[PDB]
């Protein structure tokens, strides 16, 4: 290791691998919102959205939930039994907007995901449109 | 408040949903629907009580009965459909009160949520998501 030493610089977002070429982007600034980043070349074209887009994102969402990465606006961790509408920009590796992901958790067993290419976020929005703390 | 802002009445056709709640349908094809509250007992959006939910429940049902809401594809929102539909709730002077989130799960149950801090971007429609 002779010579200089490597140091890590502080980044805006910390990327956490959800699998299927998808990353959870968590901003170091706790005041700004979580994003998702697609690195998979088979998900580069957001016009022709096929079922495998849904199947991969399904897996990434489950992982995100297992990791307990998201918490409600009250500060409480999103726990099974809860229901919500959670939104996030999906960007590529050059931070370009691809679509908005809508995640609609209905109960502990089922969610609906929807890709909305035309829904733009306002600067001051968080990730939650709505939620409901359940059993 | 006794009367509506003029800019409001030139831009939207109000349609009574009942409960001092109006559907505001823009004349311009390319604009989104709003909701207007005229009821004095719903003037303060900090202290939101159960009757806020009860009146809006009724208004939403009437809105659906009237078939006022249609998807992008022009499909009229029919029973069996599910969705996430949003709209600004304004007062008679066109001032933002809250954002209404409407989550329809099926032919029976919907959830409504009032979100005072969710601001709409100019280019958004009312639907965040839907399922036919």
Curated annotation (Swiss-Prot), chain A:
The chain holds residues 266 to 399 of 542 of the full protein. Lectin involved in the quality control of the secretory pathway. As a member of the endoplasmic reticulum-associated degradation lumenal (ERAD-L) surveillance system, targets misfolded endoplasmic reticulum lumenal glycoproteins for degradation. The recognition of targets is N-glycan specific. Functions in recruiting misfolded protein substrates in conjunction with HRD3. This is Protein OS-9 homolog. It is found in: Endoplasmic reticulum membrane. Glycans are attached at residue 116. Belongs to the OS-9 family. It comes from the Eukaryota. The MRH (mannose 6-phosphate receptor homology) domain is required for the ERAD-L activity. Disruption phenotype: Interaction of substrate with HRD1 is reduced; in YOS9 and USA1 double mutants this interaction is completely abolished. Interaction of substrate (either glycosylated or non-glycosylated) with HRD3 is not affected. Homodimer. Component of the HRD1 ubiquitin ligase complex which contains the E3 ligase HRD1, its cofactors HRD3, USA1 and DER1, substrate recruiting factor YOS9 and CDC48-binding protein UBX2. Within the complex, interacts (via N-terminus) with HRD3. In ERAD-L, HRD3 and YOS9 jointly bind misfolded glycoproteins in the endoplasmic reticulum (ER) lumen.
């Amino acid at each position: 290791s002779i010579g200089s030493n490597s140091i890590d610089l502080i980044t805006k977002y910390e990327p956490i691998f959800l699998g299927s070429g998808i990353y959870f982007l968590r901003p170091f600034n706790t005041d700004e919102r979580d994003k998702l980043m697609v690195t998979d070349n088979a998900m580069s074209n957001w016009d022709e959205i096929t079922e495998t887009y849904y199947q991969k994102f399904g897996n990434a969402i489950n992982k995100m939930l297992s990791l307990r990465l998201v918490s409600l606006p009250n500060g409480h961790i999103l726990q099974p039994g809860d229901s919500c509408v959670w939104l996030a920009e999906v960007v590529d590796m050059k931070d370009r907007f691809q679509t908005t992901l809508s995640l609609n958790i209905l109960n502990s067993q089922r969610a609906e995901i929807f890709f909305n290419k035309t829904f733009t976020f306002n600067e001051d929005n968080g990730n939650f449109l709505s939620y409901k703390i359940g059993d």
